[PDB]
Amino acid sequence: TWLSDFPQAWAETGGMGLAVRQAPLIIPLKATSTPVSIKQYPMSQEARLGIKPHIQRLLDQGILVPCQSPWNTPLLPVKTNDYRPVQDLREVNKRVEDIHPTVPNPYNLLSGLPPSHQWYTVLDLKDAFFCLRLHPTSQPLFAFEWRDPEMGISGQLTWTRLPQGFKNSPTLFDEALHRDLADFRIQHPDLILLQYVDDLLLAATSELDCQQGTRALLQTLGNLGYRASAKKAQICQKQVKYLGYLLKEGQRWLTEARKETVMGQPTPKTPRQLREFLGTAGFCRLWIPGFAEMAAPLYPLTKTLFNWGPDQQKAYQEIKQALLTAPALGLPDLTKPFELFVDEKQGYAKGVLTQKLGPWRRPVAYLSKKLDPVAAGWPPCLRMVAAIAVLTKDAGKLTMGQPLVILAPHAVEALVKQPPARMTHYQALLLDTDRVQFGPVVALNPATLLPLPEELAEAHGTRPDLTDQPLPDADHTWYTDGSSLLQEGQRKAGAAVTTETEVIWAKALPAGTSAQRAELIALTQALKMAEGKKLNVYTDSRYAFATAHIHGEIYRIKNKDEILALLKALFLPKRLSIIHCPGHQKGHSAEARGNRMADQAARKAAITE
């Protein structure tokens, strides 16, 4: 019945389309653009003859027309032996003035949907772009040569309508359609309408509201002169596919085809295929838990040395895994209170925006973001605040300023008060407690990022990441010793900082000093000359180690000078490990050979001043 009732609206019965309310389109060029005439590809007869009936049908529809242009472009045959035509308009698309794609991404277009309307109706428009006319000024632009080598017919043609392959067409169509349907939006409130270029989704409350709205909408499309696909349409259904997103009963999955386009491209290895493997996955980042931390190893191959290691082969595989395990997301409903759980690790934020479904929480999104460098330098509980802050900013886009109950593994509401600089920016949109609120401290699933039944202060901190660990990079092996007891007269006073083979650094000290201050002065000095070369420092004296390894302790002792120099001198090399190996210095493996050498340097090369 639907086809008989709307004869004009359906492509199979209503014939060709033509947007009657849209004036022909002039196409602005760049000032520096000129006509470009490309040699047409010499084509096979098997291909050329296979193309002709498609071109013949366009001429008869007035769409293509003969011309004599200084522009030209080629004609590429494509594809079983059923060769259809393609133009390739790269050399034009270079020369044409760009317009701004005002179009917002598919997902956040869908984010303008409520679950109040669970009766859907999807359409798509056949040969859409061709319904927009081309102003005769612009027609010559899109010229291309055609021939018949069994008829002598070697001449030029061009488009009266908007072609297929011109860069701005989707955008230009979108604006035009938007305008045409603003009329329909105004005279039909209550319904929701979603468009992106050549796809339409009509949401309704009951089946009755949908049927009437659909009828109205179709009647309009015929009036406007756009033609909908009778085959691929979806009329008055609870479950519907749209823009690669499967909708059903207030939920939102990815259609397997939308997965497949990401799943069905090989390991890129080129910077373009890699950049556009990330590009394509970008629409699906809202289903991936912790996409920011997952996608870390690949962002350095944006722009480069293309070393595809195990860490990146893993990261590329975690994504497909996450895509294969992509869950249902709920549409944001906007009446209930929302609940954003959050976590951070390795400079990467990650979290989930959810809300109540019965006594359950059904996620609405998976929001993640990398902490910017200044914040990534901060301590744990700080970087937990930043992450909450960042995800809260983004969540706001989906919440539309509605009730929001934050959660985290470190309860950091008290921290908002006392920061001993950058917090004015955060505290603004955290402690504005009309919209925002905190909630119970809680652990999360590495996998789902949902809460676990599991119950600290934020009043702490002092020391770095110092260990008793010969670090795996194995950089400078430096053995430190000193000497301030008396021998054959008076107190010697001498330091040394050697290695297994060389001498590196050494000196004498003042006549005074102490007995064991020498060892400190040598170690301080050994720790000055180091910065971005890792270092592991061996100590012969055991007083030196402990005081120096504790950490870093503030006080409320009668030797502050050397000490307060040492305490501050330790923040200098990135990743340090103070070890102490007199085990044994008397001696000799591939280790204590250099300990021996530091002990022989600080005694001999010490009696000079």
Partner: protein
């Protein structure tokens, strides 16, 4: 009773619950026999040979062998013990898969500290360690002091059910009566009677909680309204024996018997976290020893064992998860020595200490990395060292 020597025994229970749950055999091959104090020995000998005839009828070859050899194993073991000692006898026998394939009879039999009514016997495909972990529910005697202008209460919170002891009040003047004296003549009488009241608090706490040798109460918590919740902490009018046993100082209003019940409710978490707070105090005093340069400390493996055999070491402080093992062998040239490895080319060393700390030294305390001072102890000093009695050279 030493609350420190007990905490290592309870550690050795926690490690037996880890290892018995880990090991698992094949079919009905695992006996979990627990004997109380009061029940006779030949009664159990009779109850085992009872089950030997009930395990003759089984009819399933390999596990029938396993039960008969294991009930034959426990009867030989139980015969070498004449009746029951004053705590009881806990037992675990069965065959299980170890490393490299192989078979392994475990054979456990010992005396814990009081399972009085615990009478359990279960044969199964895995052991049953529910009764041992029932020994680790023991919330100790926890002390309470609450002070207010009107009066003071003294009492005890032993787990959940609450107790109260001495209700005493001491008068001190309120407001400012500006009669026939001067402005400041009452200010002097305020500190006078407050400091009098604080001394009386100090002496009354000294009497009831201590008892005599060893402090009755395992830990204390303080609470108050005015300077009473500052005055007592800073000034050591409070120190006499029990000051070291103090957990945390609580802030409260009311100050009567309903102050008591705010304090117990704000201090439920801290009383259950004895080990964590006591850990951070014990690591606390270790680090203070290095700060004062008072040379009563040591660290690392070879320095510790030196302090052990010398018997300088008062208190040994070791991380529960020490990767190190100790080793003792016949070698080449028929001799006997001790190596202690870290990385691969007997038992754990933490396990060895747990048993033999009493021998030379001789005090042990087990520590964790969860504590932020414990974390420092671990990754900084390799999780081994201790409190000594005097100055030591080494090098």
């Amino acid at each position: 009773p030493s609350a420190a020597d007990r905490n290592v025994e309870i550690w050795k229970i926690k490690k037996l619950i880890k290892s018995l749950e880990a090991a698992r055999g094949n079919g009905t091959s695992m006996i979990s026999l627990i004997i109380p104090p009061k029940d006779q020995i030949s009664r159990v000998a009779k109850m085992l040979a009872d089950e030997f005839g009930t395990a003759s009828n089984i009819k399933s070859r390999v596990n029938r062998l396993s039960v008969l050899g294991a009930i034959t194993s426990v009867q030989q073991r139980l015969k070498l013990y004449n009746k029951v000692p004053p705590n009881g006898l806990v037992v675990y026998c069965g065959t299980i898969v170890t490393e490299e394939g192989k078979e392994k009879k475990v054979n456990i039999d010992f005396e814990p500290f009081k399972p009085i009514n615990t009478s359990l016997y279960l044969c199964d495909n895995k052991f049953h360690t529910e009764a041992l972990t029932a020994l680790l529910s023991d919330d100790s005697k926890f002390g309470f002091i609450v002070i207010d202008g009107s009066g003071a209460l003294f009492g005890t919170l032993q787990g959940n059910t609450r107790e109260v002891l001495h209700k005493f009040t001491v008068d001190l003047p309120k407001k400012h009566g500006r009669g026939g004296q001067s402005a400041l003549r009452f200010a002097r009488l305020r500190m006078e009677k407050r400091h009098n009241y604080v001394r009386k608090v100090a002496e009354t706490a000294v009497q009831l909680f201590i008892s005599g040798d060893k402090v009755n109460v395992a830990g204390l918590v303080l609470a108050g309204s005015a300077d009473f919740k500052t005055e007592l902490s800073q000034s050591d009018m409070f120190d006499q024996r029990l000051q070291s046993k103090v957990l945390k100082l609580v802030d409260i209003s009311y100050g009567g018997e309903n102050g008591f019940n705010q304090a117990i409710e704000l201090s439920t978490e801290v009383l259950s976290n004895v080990k964590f707070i006591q850990e951070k105090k014990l690591i606390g005093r270790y680090f203070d020893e290095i700060s004062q340069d008072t040379g009563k400390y040591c660290f690392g493996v070879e320095d510790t064992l030196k302090a052990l055999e010398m018997g300088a070491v008062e208190i040994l402080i070791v991380y529960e998860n020490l990767d190190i093992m100790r080793y003792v062998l016949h070698c080449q040239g028929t001799e006997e020595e001790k190596i202690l490895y870290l990385t691969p080319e007997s038992m754990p060393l933490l396990e060895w200490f747990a048993n033999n700390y009493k021998k030379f030294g001789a005090t042990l305390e087990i520590v964790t990395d969860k504590s932020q001072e414990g974390s420092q102890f671990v990754k900084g000093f390799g999780g081994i060292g201790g409190i000594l009695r005097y100055r030591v050279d080494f090098q």
